[PDB]
């Protein structure tokens, strides 16, 4: 099995600690490694954190705050990643890595949910086909939604008040900066399609609570 | 003070070689201890490639990669380079340059990835590249956008207003299609007194086929 495992998932609450783990196989003593720890949130770069050896060898990344420490478990064989006062903006994806017979392994990476967050319904702007658009003889309805949580909805699409289902695509929700979800979904039509209802509605479901936002021709 | 300035993302077919650089700013290439790169499989974690080594040109691979990784530099244009060969679909991915520093630790000298280049998604596809078809959306706040539609491979970027434009804005991921093809929306939240005299164009940028699109989008 790999030589380093994360946790896929770990939450925590705000204020308190959280403690990641990065436990070594058996066969390798946590005791022998030195384990360096990186920080990535969506859309950028890895961050250098840290690494620690032992209490009297171990060094901070720069520009990386105290409430980041390392430490090692013994009994568990594994390397330690200790987030203290614990904030919002910690979420994101941490990795541990050795050197280990000349090569960086990688562990799998845990995913940091930080508790507490709560409800929130979301934001829909739904915009009709643009006219550049509908000259090309295509037709698109966007429907635009931020700013909810937890990170689940499901979309469903009228034609004045028929369900329509064929010509619709929704994106998984996906976290916003803020914490937050955003997701989209965009119905293809004909111009004629478009032209010949009165009206057409993306209806968005959160919590078994639905926002609907019309659009006519 | 050094920073890395890596090059742009793009498609490749199966069987081609990958070719990244990275340009080193604010300082030199060498003095330092080394470079390397990583990569990332979108969704997935990171995979150390290789790294080389300053002092000695020294090179150090990914066992599992070795036969077809090739990481050098040139002190002239003070730029790292990796190359990649007989690449297929495995190895679509974010690849990062990063410069490595050494530690001294107890009974070892060991090393970290210590500054990153912003990362340069590389698709390998047998499917051609698509430029996006982009469409203004019309609109106190009012909300006005682009439809940035029917384009391959990742990754596209909108900017407003060539990047004056920030507060506000809201650039959604894209949707992938089942035809394969992706589409994505920005919209800017803007005050609604400001429309008749305050222009807004969204500028779409998709480097793998290298077109860049600027869309005036109005009342």
């Known amino acids: 099995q790999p030589v380093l495992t994360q946790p896929t998932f770990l939450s925590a609450s705000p204020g308190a600690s959280a403690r990641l783990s990065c436990t070594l196989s058996?066969?390798?003593?946590?005791?022998?490694?030195?384990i360096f720890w990186y920080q990535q949130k969506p859309g950028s770069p890895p961050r250098y954190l840290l690494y620690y050896y032992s209490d009297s060898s171990k060094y901070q990344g720069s520009g990386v705050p105290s409430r980041f420490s390392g430490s090692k478990d013994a009994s568990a064989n594994a390397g330690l990643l200790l987030i203290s006062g614990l904030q919002s903006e910690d979420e994101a994806d941490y990795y541990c890595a050795i050197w280990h017979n000349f090569a960086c392994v990688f562990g799998g990476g845990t995913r940091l949910t930080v508790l507490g967050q709560p409800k929130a319904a979301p934001s829909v702007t739904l915009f009709p086909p643009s006219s550049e658009e509908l000259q090309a003889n295509k037709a698109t309805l966007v429907c635009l939604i931020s700013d909810f949580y937890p990170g689940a909805v499901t979309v469903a699409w009228k034609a004045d008040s028929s369900p329509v289902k064929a010509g619709v695509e929704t994106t998984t929700p996906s976290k916003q900066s803020n914490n937050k979800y955003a997701a989209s979904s965009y119905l293809s039509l004909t111009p004629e399609q478009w032209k010949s209802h009165r009206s057409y509605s993306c209806q968005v479901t959160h919590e078994g609570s639905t926002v609907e936002k019309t659009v006519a021709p | 003070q050094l920073q890395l300035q890596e090059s742009g993302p793009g498609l490749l077919k199966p069987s081609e070689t990958l070719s990244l650089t990275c340009a080193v700013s604010?300082?030199?290439?060498?003095?330092?201890?080394?470079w390397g790169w990583i990569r990332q499989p979108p969704g997935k974690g990171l995979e150390w490639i290789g790294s080389?080594?300053?002092?000695?040109?020294?090179?150090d691979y990914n066992p599992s990669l070795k036969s077809r990784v090739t990481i050098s530099t040139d002190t002239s244009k003070n730029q790292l380079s990796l190359k990649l060969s007989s690449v297929t679909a495995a190895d679509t991915a974010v690849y990062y340059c990063?410069?490595?520093?050494?530690?001294?630790?107890?009974?070892?000298?060991?090393?970290?990835?210590?500054?990153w280049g912003q990362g340069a998604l590389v698709t390998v596809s047998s499917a051609s590249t698509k430029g996006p078809s982009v469409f203004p959306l019309a609109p106190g706040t009012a909300a006005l956008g682009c439809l940035v539609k029917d384009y391959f491979p990742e990754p596209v970027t909108v900017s407003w207003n060539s990047g004056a434009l920030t507060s506000g804005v809201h650039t959604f991921p894209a949707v992938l299609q089942s035809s394969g093809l992706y589409s994505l929306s920005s919209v800017v939240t803007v005050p609604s007194s400001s429309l008749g005299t305050q222009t807004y164009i969204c500028n779409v940028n998709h480097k793998p086929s290298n077109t860049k699109v600027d869309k005036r989008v109005e009342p």
């Open positions: 058996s066969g390798i003593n946590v005791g022998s490694y030195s």
């Open positions: 080389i080594y300053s002092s000695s040109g020294s090179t």
């Open positions: 990063a410069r490595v520093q050494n530690i001294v630790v107890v009974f070892t000298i060991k090393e970290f990835f210590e500054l």
């Open positions: 604010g300082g030199s290439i060498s003095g330092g201890y080394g």
